[PDB]
Design a protein around this ligand. Structure first.
Ligand SMILES: [Cl-]
Ligand SMILES: [Cl-]
Ligand code: NA
Lengths: 99, 99
């Protein structure tokens, strides 16, 4: 698709067999999702946002579908105000910004 | 241009007679710049995201040039960790996300 930005670029994702809404975020290095259960072991990570820093759980090699496009990569889980798809997965699905 | 997302999508902007670097951020509703002077009236605002909220000054009808493209809109000024061009100005330069 070609997604304009008059509204927030929200898409449906599928993770763990469940559908969720998430924001396509070119200003995010990483993908961050609200609390949910993911398999395997996690590693610690500190991330920064407009307000300061939060601690998250880093899960690697997670299967995730983004607007119908398959990806497998790192997902951070923590107290984000919104589910965000960052550049680590935007690159996997071939996303570019154009103007 | 077409901008890939292998690295942060930073561009040069001209605002307030000043050149700055800023991040093209589809996950931001609004444009937020580090402390600087702008002309005109302003009013206070709180904006939020991953580590909570910060207080900014809201200036309306500010002319900006973003990678060579002129636009006008609201610019928020305050202690942001990064200069960000959000959707309110991305739309004006015709920016889309494509995949
Ligand atoms: Cl505006
Ligand atoms: Cl348009
Ligand atoms: Na003004």
């Amino acid at each position: 698709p070609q997604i304009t930005l008059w509204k927030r670029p929200l898409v449906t994702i599928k993770i763990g067999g469940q559908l969720k809404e998430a924001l396509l975020d070119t200003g995010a290095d990483d993908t961050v999702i609200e609390e949910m259960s993911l398999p395997g072991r996690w590693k610690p990570k500190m991330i920064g946002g407009i307000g300061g820093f939060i601690k998250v759980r880093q899960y690697d090699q997670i299967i995730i579908e983004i607007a119908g496009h398959k990806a497998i990569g790192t997902v951070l889980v923590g107290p984000t105000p919104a589910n965000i798809i960052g550049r680590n997965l935007l690159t996997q699905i071939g996303a570019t910004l154009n103007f």
